[PDB]
Amino acid sequence: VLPQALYLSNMRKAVKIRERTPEDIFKPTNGIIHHFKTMHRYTLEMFRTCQFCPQFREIIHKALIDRNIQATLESQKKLNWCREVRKLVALKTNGDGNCLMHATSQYMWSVQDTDLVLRKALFSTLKETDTRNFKFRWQLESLKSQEFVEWNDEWDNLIKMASTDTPGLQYNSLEEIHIFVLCNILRRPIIVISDKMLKVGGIYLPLHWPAQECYRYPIVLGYDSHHFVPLVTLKDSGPEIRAVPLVNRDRGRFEDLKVHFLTDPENEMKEKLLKEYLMVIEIPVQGWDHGTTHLINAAKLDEANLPKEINLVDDYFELVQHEYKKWQ
Amino acid sequence: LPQALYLSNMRKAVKIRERTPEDIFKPTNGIIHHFKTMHRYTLEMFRTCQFCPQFREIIHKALIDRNIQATLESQKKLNWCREVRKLVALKTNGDGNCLMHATSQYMWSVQDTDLVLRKALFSTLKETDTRNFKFRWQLESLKDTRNWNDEWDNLIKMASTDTPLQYNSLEEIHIFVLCNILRRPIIVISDKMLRSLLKVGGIYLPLHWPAQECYRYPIVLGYDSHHFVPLVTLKDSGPEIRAVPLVNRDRGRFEDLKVHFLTDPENEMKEKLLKEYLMVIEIPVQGWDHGTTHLINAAKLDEANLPKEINLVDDYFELVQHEYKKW
Ligand SMILES: [Cl-]
Ligand SMILES: [Cl-]
Ligand SMILES: [Cl-]
């Protein structure tokens, strides 16, 4: 009786949201990258389910939450490992090959990229524009691997992969460089939480923009088994800190998340860049010695600001509230 | 495109439903409870001739009960008048509450899935004096040994939300009480054997109110294979007019739709009574006994008035447009 999926909650409002997104894209004449004027500043949060009763939560969780990927990322200690910060939850995402965009769109707007607006914007940048600095940063990162098994064509195909052409799934899968291009279209950092953190895990900064022109709260995604999902903040979950840690525990120490595609001079000042493009806070967490506390960096996460008029989750919630009363 | 109408805006459906029980007025002097404002709303369906057949097909599988539409048209019971706007049958859940689902959709574009209408029928039957309803029903029953009290008790029991199909099926007297709860006539177009070779079909008037206190456009339902659906008017330009005939063809003559549960004096002045509660017009039709045309009575049907704010069909339409432009 609930909606089997989120979008089913108000199919009309979804269409409207989607229809607003192309119009918010500004397309510079002079080669500066096309970018969103306003909508990149939106953030969705998930509503609390604990005040409901078990058979009801199940309905909701089955309907909304990717429980397989949540359990995977949690058991490998990459997701929600830190007791001090608010819980993040994975939302179901279509796994058609366009899931990088479906998850990113959902994180901001509560809809997936089914009209291909984000997908087309990515391809657009990598074909209609020249992309010299992108290719360079990609070469630099590729050559960091201590070994090369014996690449003239590799860049051209990466551009082809971003196309909406059919490959296997409906769309070609995307890779790290596409995430970095995407964060520059959004003027917003993307942080990807995964097991290897094919190395998609880590931090993507909109370096083709001065931080002054960017939104300083990240989009947070989860990645496992070739699949992206958004990892959204669970609402009213104080007193825990609204932030995502910029390190993980690894073999008894804290290890920094990878920052992708930096030049040598940028890499030398990685901490300074992180502090410009995110809101970095230094928080205490328990040590391996129960008698020690450690300070680590974390980045503030945004508060829910997606208005009702364009929020499928609020409508989902009222559906839930109307239904719960019938169950009580 | 969504597979059913309500999947088009689940949030709005709930809003609509949440308004209904608050619109009911419960009197303390014994007068039946009834709707204050929402009984006046009427839904119209949008046209799909502006689309290509493959698309038409998807809209029609989603919205239209084509089985019942085809059955009633093939008997010349539905859409047989050349002068008049087409009516279309919408899909309705067949769970034993379909009388209420179809009535609710006709006015409000949502089904009775909170049981508001069903509960209001059972409430009137169980918790007020129903002496007049019973008397009228006895007269219709008589027009083997009968036990009136046992049978009346059973009809009240059928109205409940008790599982017996998820719910008990309802019959004529329930439609009669319902139209008095809505203060609005209900006209049922039903499947019926050819006279040459049923009883639910006909006109139910809110005779427990003066006509001046009732809405004077009817609710129109179809009935076949024990199932009710709303028959809503199709939006259109001119020149054809919005109406529903009040008689059926019967070979070379016409047969008046049954007017249910009348007392004998009322039945004597039936045409007068129909003109009080409905807007009765005369429409010329081609004759089947000799004679180019004959005038038959028909009732005017309402224009669409269900504001967008509470219209799932508008939202459905806007989805059709978006999804269409893409192809
Ligand atoms: Cl911790
Ligand atoms: Cl450890
Ligand atoms: Cl320690």
Swiss-Prot record, chain B:
Effect the entry attributes to changing residue 171 to A: Strongly reduced 'Lys-48' deubiquitinase activity
Region span, TRAF-binding: 53-271
Documented effect of changing residue 65 to A: Minor effect on 'Lys-48' deubiquitinase activity. Strongly reduced 'Lys-63' deubiquitinase activity
Domain of life: Eukaryota
Record region (Interaction with ubiquitin): 169-171
Residues forming the catalytic site: 95, 98 (nucleophile), 227 (proton acceptor)
Effect on the protein of changing residue 169 to A: Strongly reduced 'Lys-48' deubiquitinase activity
Domain OTU: 87-234
Subcellular location: Cytoplasm
Stated name of the protein: A20p50
Gene source species: Homo sapiens (Human)
Entire protein: shown range: 6 to 356 of 790
